[PDB]
Amino acid sequence: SFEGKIALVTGASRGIGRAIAETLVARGAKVIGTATSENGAKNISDYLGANGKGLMLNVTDPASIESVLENIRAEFGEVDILVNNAGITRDNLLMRMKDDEWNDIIETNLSSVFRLSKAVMRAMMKKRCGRIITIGSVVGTMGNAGQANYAAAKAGLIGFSKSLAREVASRGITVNVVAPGFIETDMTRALSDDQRAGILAQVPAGRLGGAQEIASAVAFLASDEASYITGETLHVNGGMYMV
Amino acid sequence: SFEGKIALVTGASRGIGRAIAETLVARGAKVIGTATSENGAKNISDYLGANGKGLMLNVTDPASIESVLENIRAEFGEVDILVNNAGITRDNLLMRMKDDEWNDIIETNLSSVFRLSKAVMRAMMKKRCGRIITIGSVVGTMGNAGQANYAAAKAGLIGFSKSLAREVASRGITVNVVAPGFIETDMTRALSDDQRAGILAQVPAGRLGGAQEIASAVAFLASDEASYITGETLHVNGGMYMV
Amino acid sequence: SFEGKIALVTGASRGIGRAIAETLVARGAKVIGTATSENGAKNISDYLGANGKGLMLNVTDPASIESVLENIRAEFGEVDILVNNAGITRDNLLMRMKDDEWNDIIETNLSSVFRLSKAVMRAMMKKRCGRIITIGSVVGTMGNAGQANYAAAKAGLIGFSKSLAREVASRGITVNVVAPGFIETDMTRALSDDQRAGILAQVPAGRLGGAQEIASAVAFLASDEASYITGETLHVNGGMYMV
Amino acid sequence: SFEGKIALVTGASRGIGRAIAETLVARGAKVIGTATSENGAKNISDYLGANGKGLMLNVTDPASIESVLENIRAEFGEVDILVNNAGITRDNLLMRMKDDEWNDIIETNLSSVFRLSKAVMRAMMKKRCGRIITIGSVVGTMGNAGQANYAAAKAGLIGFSKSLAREVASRGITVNVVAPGFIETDMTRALSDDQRAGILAQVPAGRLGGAQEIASAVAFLASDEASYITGETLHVNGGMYMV
Ligand SMILES: NC(=O)C1=CN([C@@H]2O[C@H](COP(=O)(O)OP(=O)(O)OC[C@H]3O[C@@H](n4cnc5c(N)ncnc54)[C@H](OP(=O)(O)O)[C@@H]3O)[C@@H](O)[C@H]2O)C=CC1
Ligand SMILES: NC(=O)C1=CN([C@@H]2O[C@H](COP(=O)(O)OP(=O)(O)OC[C@H]3O[C@@H](n4cnc5c(N)ncnc54)[C@H](OP(=O)(O)O)[C@@H]3O)[C@@H](O)[C@H]2O)C=CC1
Ligand SMILES: NC(=O)C1=CN([C@@H]2O[C@H](COP(=O)(O)OP(=O)(O)OC[C@H]3O[C@@H](n4cnc5c(N)ncnc54)[C@H](OP(=O)(O)O)[C@@H]3O)[C@@H](O)[C@H]2O)C=CC1
Ligand SMILES: NC(=O)C1=CN([C@@H]2O[C@H](COP(=O)(O)OP(=O)(O)OC[C@H]3O[C@@H](n4cnc5c(N)ncnc54)[C@H](OP(=O)(O)O)[C@@H]3O)[C@@H](O)[C@H]2O)C=CC1
Ligand code: NA
Ligand code: NA
Numbered sequence: 023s024f025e026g027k028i029a030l031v032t033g034a035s036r037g038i039g040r041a042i043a044e045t046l047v048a049r050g051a052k053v054i055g056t057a058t059s060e061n062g063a064k065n066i067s068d069y070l071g072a073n074g075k076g077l078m079l080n081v082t083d084p085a086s087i088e089s090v091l092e093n094i095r096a097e098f099g100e101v102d103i104l105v106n107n108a109g110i111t112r113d114n115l116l117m118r119m120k121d122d123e124w125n126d127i128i129e130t131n132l133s134s135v136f137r138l139s140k141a142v143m144r145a146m147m148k149k150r151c152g153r154i155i156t157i158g159s160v161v162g163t164m165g166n167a168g169q170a171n172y173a174a175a176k177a178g179l180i181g182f183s184k185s186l187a188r189e190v191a192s193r194g195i196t197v198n199v200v201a202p203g204f205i206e207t208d209m210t211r212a213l214s215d216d217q218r219a220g221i222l223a224q225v226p227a228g229r230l231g232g233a234q235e236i237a238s239a240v241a242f243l244a245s246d247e248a249s250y251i252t253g254e255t256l257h258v259n260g261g262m263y264m265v
Numbered sequence: 266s267f268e269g270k271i272a273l274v275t276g277a278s279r280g281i282g283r284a285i286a287e288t289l290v291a292r293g294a295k296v297i298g299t300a301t302s303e304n305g306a307k308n309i310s311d312y313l314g315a316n317g318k319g320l321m322l323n324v325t326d327p328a329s330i331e332s333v334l335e336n337i338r339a340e341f342g343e344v345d346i347l348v349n350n351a352g353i354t355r356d357n358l359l360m361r362m363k364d365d366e367w368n369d370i371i372e373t374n375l376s377s378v379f380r381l382s383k384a385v386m387r388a389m390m391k392k393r394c395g396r397i398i399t400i401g402s403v404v405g406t407m408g409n410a411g412q413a414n415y416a417a418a419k420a421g422l423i424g425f426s427k428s429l430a431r432e433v434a435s436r437g438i439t440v441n442v443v444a445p446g447f448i449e450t451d452m453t454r455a456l457s458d459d460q461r462a463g464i465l466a467q468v469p470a471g472r473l474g475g476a477q478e479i480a481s482a483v484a485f486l487a488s489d490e491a492s493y494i495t496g497e498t499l500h501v502n503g504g505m506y507m508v
Numbered sequence: 509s510f511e512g513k514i515a516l517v518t519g520a521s522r523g524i525g526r527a528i529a530e531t532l533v534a535r536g537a538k539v540i541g542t543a544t545s546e547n548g549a550k551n552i553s554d555y556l557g558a559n560g561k562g563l564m565l566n567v568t569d570p571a572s573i574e575s576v577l578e579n580i581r582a583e584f585g586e587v588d589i590l591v592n593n594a595g596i597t598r599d600n601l602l603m604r605m606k607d608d609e610w611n612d613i614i615e616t617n618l619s620s621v622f623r624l625s626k627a628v629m630r631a632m633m634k635k636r637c638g639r640i641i642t643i644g645s646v647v648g649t650m651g652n653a654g655q656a657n658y659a660a661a662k663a664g665l666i667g668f669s670k671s672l673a674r675e676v677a678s679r680g681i682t683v684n685v686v687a688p689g690f691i692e693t694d695m696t697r698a699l700s701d702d703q704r705a706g707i708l709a710q711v712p713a714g715r716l717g718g719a720q721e722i723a724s725a726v727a728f729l730a731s732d733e734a735s736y737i738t739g740e741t742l743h744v745n746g747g748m749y750m751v
Numbered sequence: 752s753f754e755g756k757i758a759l760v761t762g763a764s765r766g767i768g769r770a771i772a773e774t775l776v777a778r779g780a781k782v783i784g785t786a787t788s789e790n791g792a793k794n795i796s797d798y799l800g801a802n803g804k805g806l807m808l809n810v811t812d813p814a815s816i817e818s819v820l821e822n823i824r825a826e827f828g829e830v831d832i833l834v835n836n837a838g839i840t841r842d843n844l845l846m847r848m849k850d851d852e853w854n855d856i857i858e859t860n861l862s863s864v865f866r867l868s869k870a871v872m873r874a875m876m877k878k879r880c881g882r883i884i885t886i887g888s889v890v891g892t893m894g895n896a897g898q899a900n901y902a903a904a905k906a907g908l909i910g911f912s913k914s915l916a917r918e919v920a921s922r923g924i925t926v927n928v929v930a931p932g933f934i935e936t937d938m939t940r941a942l943s944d945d946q947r948a949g950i951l952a953q954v955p956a957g958r959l960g961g962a963q964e965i966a967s968a969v970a971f972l973a974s975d976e977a978s979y980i981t982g983e984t985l986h987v988n989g990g991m992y993m994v
Contacts, residue, residue, distance in 0.1 A: 181906025
């Protein structure tokens with residue numbers, strides 16, 4: 023399914039990013055997963071073993087981006103599949119939201135998509151084949167109190183993706199977004215009973231999503247069987263929102 | 266894979282419906298495909314072989330629906346996956362559109378979705394597992410001059426699907442729409458050389474889609490890897506429209 | 509603002525339809541409001557007085573539609589502004605939904621839009637000016653358990669409107685949808701405390717909408733100041749849903 | 752009318768911003784319009800006369816924002832209506848897009864919306880009344896080749912607006928977006944004869960929009976007749992895109 027393809031998955035330490043990396047490996051890809059520390063990069067190298075490696079990447083630092091891409095090109099080849107998964111939250115109601123909480127979210131969650139996409143596009147255009155998949159959020163579509171920064175970044179990456187899709191579609195490259203709802207992570211596992219119940223009440227499916235479920239959606243769009251899907255957002259949210 | 270799941274694909278004679286039926290068989294489903302005539306049903310039985318059967322079905326006729334589902338239950342079992350693919354066009358500008366052209370489109374393309382979905386839901390709710398997937402159209406979301414009837418039906422089945430999705434989500438059933446752009450079939454071949462050039466100019470991918478590309482999307486949603494996707498529309502249109 | 513214009517408002521007896529009629533009159537229109545009984549038509553004639561009249565109209569009966577339009581053409585002139593407000597509900601979970609509850613909703617809420625729009629379009633096309641505005645619902649966009657019929661009709665009229673908009677836009681006619689959320693009516697006034705509280709919890713604004721608020725939106729789109737809005741849905745729902 | 756309401760319109764020198772400012776004055780608002788230079792501010796003061804004032808504002812500079820709002824509070828009072836109209840383009844295909852062209856668009860077109868909205872919200876929350884309206888673009892929803900930066904900002908401000916809308920709705924404040932299609936201004940005049948023909952071919956209305964048509968939409972949302980509209984995008988594009 024992905025035999026001979028090279029994938030770059032940003033933020034592949036755990037959860038969604040790790041499930042994406044593992045799924046792509048399971049279906050034949052060579053995967054480079056990234057973390058913000060050399061130790062995180064080591065842990066990624068450890069689970070990937072013979073099927074890829076971990077590298078330290080800061081998606082807000084241009085020099086870090088060039089270093090990582092040159093390493094990949096030296097050891098593996100040109101990136102066929104880019105999965106923009108790295109992302110953070112800095113929640114606050116707007117009157118409490120600090121300028122840094124705004125700027126860091128825009129930089130890490132939106133400007134990252136610009137930087138990484140631009141860095142891989144030339145080789146994909148030459149090859150007349152490629153996949154760019156960004157992990158958005160239901161919050162980008164519905165909005166959410168206390169997450170106006172996160173919502174701005176997650177909505178903004180859809181506008182970005184639609185525009186890039188229009189630029190590259192004629193050369194067999196697709197550019198799409200997967201938008202998760204509530205996914206079980208270490209964060210949600212630490213919530214109280216009342217807090218989890220409050221989350222579940224929002225989801226018609228009546229459960230949290232799994233990291234693997236997001237990985238399944240990404241792997242579908244990354245495949246040869248999604249060649250006619252571009253500029254699309256695939257919502258994976260148990261019916262929490264419906265558009 | 267779909268080992269031991271029973272799928273009903275309406276309108277499986279050719280084009281998108283046939284591609285869906287073949288894909289579901291290849292991945293382990295027992296498939297019942299339908300045509301509007303007994304001769305068409307036999308042709309379906311021929312290609313399905315030991316993995317399924319063709320039946321004559323008119324999706325506008327309640328007696329036909331009832332007879333077909335009883336035949337399926339007697340020979341195979343209860344339907345696990347319903348694919349509402351049957352559909353027609355009756356194109357005209359509104360000023361020329363005949364009552365029959367409106368009504369036949371509503372009955373064939375919209376009311377069919379109600380009738381078939383209702384007819385399979387009880388058993389899916391009992392098993393706490395099910396898939397309903399309806400083939401929509403880009404035209405349902407974009408609109409198209411000369412197709413106000415078709416657009417009404419294809420938009421209407423999205424509203425229907427979101428509502429049903431909300432009713433059944435907590436019992437492990439998903440209800441989704443796959444919305445193709447222009448696909449090379451007997452619905453499209455009838456266009457002129459300049460209509461085809463006009464359509465191609467609207468598609469960033471620079472090509473018509475293939476029937477197998479829609480089948481790939483349907484098969485993804487029908488699978489256990491799409492359990493957290495419900496009330497969603499998956500657009501497969503080469504970038505012709507982006508939402 | 510509407511001096512010299514003729515408006516037809518279907519279902520103008522009370523609530524939204526009556527507020528629409530009154531607002532259009534207040535801004536200079538001549539208004540014909542419709543009801544399903546001769547007595548309802550009388551009550552409309554009574555509030556409209558010198559600024560229009562009531563007529564008995566059944567939006568599912570073609571002969572009734574021709575009769576009403578011929579009366580309007582004789583007494584007033586050609587319809588400049590059509591507001592499709594007539595609509596019903598027949599709520600039920602899908603396994604309890606009767607065929608008549610499906611068919612009556614499609615006929616009254618969706619096929620009506622086809623019939624009335626077609627009946628007024630020729631004169632608007634000749635005049636190179638016109639407005640068609642249909643009252644949709646938030647349910648058409650979000651879906652709702654127990655309203656799959658209503659949701660199908662309300663979503664279907666958006667697809668219809670987009671297609672018709674594309675057909676007529678070049679001749680200065682716009683075709684739009686106003687989609688209310690929860691509006692205070694006689695129905696909601698009769699609800700229990702717990703029932704009203706359950707509704708309000710869904711609405712960030714924390715109140716029900718007024719019939720006049722929907723009328724304001726319709727009057728805006730009907731005006732000369734909305735000439736560049738077409739194929740659009742204007743959601744008036746206090747933030748109950750956001751697209 | 753807006754008797755005794757104070758409106759701030761960013762970028763009111765010409766085009767859409769000027770039309771918005773003039774419309775709000777004509778309907779009784781006291782208007783503060785802004786330009787990036789003192790010479791531009793005087794030109795605004797000239798046209799506003801006794802009904803308002805021009806001020807120099809840079810929406811990327813926190814000190815400029817603070818100074819301007821203090822000037823408004825000292826002379827007029829607290830802002831009741833904020834119209835975020837200031838915006839720029841820095842067009843390029845992604846492969847040629849410079850870091851500056853990305854960053855300046857994000858700062859000017861997206862982060863400005865955060866900064867200005869935050870700066871007026873406290874007083875609106877105290878009064879239990881307010882309007883925030885941001886000028887988006889069709890490109891935010893559709894995407895456009897060569898405008899991935901602009902699209903990211905214009906999509907991003909929708910996510911922002913939905914989130915803020917959710918925070919403030921219960922206190923009688925609305926937060927909405929008006930999304931113009933192609934409007935005859937200094938942003939568009941720079942296109943070639945064949946670009947203009949290419950744009951016109953994409954607009955069913957068969958014409959560019961007027962600046963006053965956007966002002967009409969803004970004025971409707973700013974009014975007391977749009978109290979139940981929040982978190983909404985009002986598309987004013989002649990049918991160029993339909994959602
Ligand atoms: N419910 C959920 O969890 C949902 C998550 N998402 C999205 O999924 C993605 C994964 O996040 P989440 O699920 O919270 O799980 P994590 O917090 O495990 O994933 C975030 C990853 O991003 C990396 N990262 C953070 N900052 C930077 C930076 N400056 N440069 C490079 N990498 C960075 C982290 O690296 P490190 O490991 O080195 O710290 C980490 O691997 C995000 O984009 C998030 O918005 C979307 C919808 C729902
Ligand atoms: N082709 C395209 O570009 C696109 C197609 N679609 C949708 O995809 C679906 C399949 O389209 P496509 O393969 O192109 O179409 P085809 O016309 O090739 O096939 C239509 C199928 O539906 C069956 N059918 C028609 N009427 C009825 C009825 N009353 N009861 C039961 N079955 C019926 C036909 O049966 P029989 O063989 O007996 O005539 C046939 O098997 C449709 O829903 C269509 O709207 C959507 C977007 C684009
Ligand atoms: N919360 C709400 O109330 C909302 C309502 N809407 C929509 O607003 C519209 C008004 O409905 P509602 O608010 O329930 O108030 P009403 O029930 O007062 O309005 C319905 C109107 O439709 C007329 N009508 C019913 N059947 C027919 C028919 N066959 N032919 C012609 N006219 C008919 C009725 O006529 P008569 O008076 O003669 O009985 C009545 O005037 C509907 O389209 C509804 O879907 C949308 C969103 C929210
Ligand atoms: N024209 C069109 O077709 C469309 C426009 N839009 C949007 O409409 C809005 C106005 O567009 P339009 O009238 O065409 O544009 P113009 O270029 O005519 O005007 C832009 C305005 O924004 C001001 N401005 C620019 N940068 C800054 C800054 N850093 N701080 C404060 N003010 C600034 C300008 O000030 P100065 O005069 O001092 O330079 C000017 O008043 C924009 O947000 C644009 O994206 C959306 C869709 C279509
Ligand atoms: Na989708
Ligand atoms: Na809208």
